[PDB]
Symmetry: C2
């Protein structure tokens, strides 16, 4: 129940009602952004959103967002070939979570999403 427990803690931090059963994929709304939270692979919390890009910029500028940084929660800009839309996502292990770990991941994903616009 690390996933169920992790989501329960996040929901309390977002002031959301806690469903009696919690399975992926879990959606949460943060400001303008619909975000999706799953466990994938096992032991990893994966969060993603579908951003509203600025692709009047070259390959180099969109790929430039994806350089590694000091923060492993910095989101990665990808394209979903199967659905024809950008996908922005980040990931961290479920076992190394502080109490606010999912909240931080969600905040980093959304800050990444806001930057893209």
């Amino acid at each position: 129940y690390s996933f169920e427990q992790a989501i329960t803690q996040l929901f309390q931090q977002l002031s959301l009602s806690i469903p009696d059963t919690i399975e992926p994929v879990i959606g949460v709304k943060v400001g303008e952004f619909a975000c999706h939270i799953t466990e994938h692979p096992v032991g990893q919390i994966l969060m993603f959103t579908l951003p509203s890009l600025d692709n009047n910029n070259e390959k180099e500028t969109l790929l430039s967002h994806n350089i590694f940084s000091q923060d492993i929660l910095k989101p990665i800009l990808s394209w979903d070939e199967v659905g024809g839309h950008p996908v922005l996502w980040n990931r961290q292990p479920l076992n190394n979570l502080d109490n606010n770990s999912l909240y931080t991941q969600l905040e980093m994903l959304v800050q990444g999403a806001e930057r893209l616009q």
Copy 2:
């Protein structure tokens, strides 16, 4: 010395001589690919190489490589703005390493690099 110890194990698995001191950044050659291994941030093993891309493909095709998968070691294609070259990289925690963990990361990075060509 998790970094020193991790590199020592990798070097034995690559049949490389072990230097008396081991600090980032560590370079290793795997087939056609010069790879670079560092600890960044602390507790994370970061590996990267500078790939020889195929950018007659749209933003969507290069960004399509970056979709998440089941393997957290799947490398991410980025651009280094400060140096004007693509950077392919992956990352995993130093604390959750099996004995062959860096070898697997290196193999996943290079397979990603080979795919790009």
